[PDB]
């Protein structure tokens, strides 16, 4: 926490909250399109001042935590897909943005 400083910590926390908020929104809308499109361009923005591997670990951890509370196989698979879209997009942006 100390190395980044208050600004990057605030950005990181609001970004994790952002991910989970968009997961909720997409579950409401019936489509993970908003998460998808908002993640087609995220890695190039993050890379210089952020760790992509750290973000992937964070999204996987949130996936595990969210799947824990659901206690229903269909619910678990749906939320797992709506997080796997985030992991998939950050993985797809290994080269430049599309």
């Amino acid at each position: 926490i100390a190395v980044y400083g208050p600004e990057r910590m605030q950005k990181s926390l609001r970004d994790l909250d952002w991910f989970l908020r968009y997961v909720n929104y997409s579950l409401v809308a019936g489509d993970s399109n908003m998460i998808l499109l908002n993640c087609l361009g995220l890695r190039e923005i993050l890379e210089k001042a952020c760790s992509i591997d750290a973000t992937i670990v964070a999204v996987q951890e949130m996936r595990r935590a969210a799947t824990g509370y659901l206690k229903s196989n269909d619910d678990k698979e749906l939320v797992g897909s709506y997080f796997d879209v985030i992991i998939r997009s950050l993985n797809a942006d290994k080269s430049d943005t599309p």
């Binding site: 908020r21 909720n24 929104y25 409401v28 809308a29």
Partner: protein
């Protein structure tokens, strides 16, 4: 366009916070009428031509001057255009009912409607009367519960015209 879901999502995204009790209440109210609205939409989509027939019959019986010479609906072309406009109004009211938002109406009917009818000389009050007749017919056809949901958007269109 927008629906109720998009409106709530944007309202809470601009604030940057999750759904509160009022949000979940709005979504539950929107979802509760969903099957009724889809049934009404199926009825209208299936029987649009019929609704046009009774709506036009009522409108032109109440105002025979429209279809007599010197009236705005006096020709085969202008009568066809009148009933075509009525079909437009019915279809876009159905779209708005299914969406739960009047954004589609403002975007794709009201934007340029007044310019069109004032350029062409179409009587706006008579168009409002035709929309009201369509409301009555479609309410009689789809049941009172769906009649109210149709009527809110029919009134939105009527107030947009007048």
């Amino acid at each position: 366009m927008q629906d109720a879901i998009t409106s709530v999502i944007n309202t809470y995204d601009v604030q940057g916070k999750y759904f509160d009790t009022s949000a979940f209440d709005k979504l539950k109210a929107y979802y509760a009428t969903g099957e009724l609205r889809v049934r009404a939409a199926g009825t209208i989509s299936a029987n649009a031509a019929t609704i046009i027939k009774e709506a036009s019959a009522k409108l032109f019986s109440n105002q025979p001057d429209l279809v007599r010479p010197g009236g705005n609906a006096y020709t085969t072309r202008r009568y066809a255009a009148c009933v075509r406009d009525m079909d437009y109004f019915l279809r876009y009211a159905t779209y708005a009912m299914l969406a739960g938002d009047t954004s589609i109406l403002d975007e794709r009917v009201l934007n340029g409607l007044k310019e069109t009818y004032n350029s062409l000389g179409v009587p706006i009050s008579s168009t409002v009367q035709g929309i009201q007749a369509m409301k009555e017919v479609t309410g009689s056809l789809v049941g009172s519960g769906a009649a109210k949901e149709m009527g809110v958007y029919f009134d939105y269109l009527s107030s947009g015209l007048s």
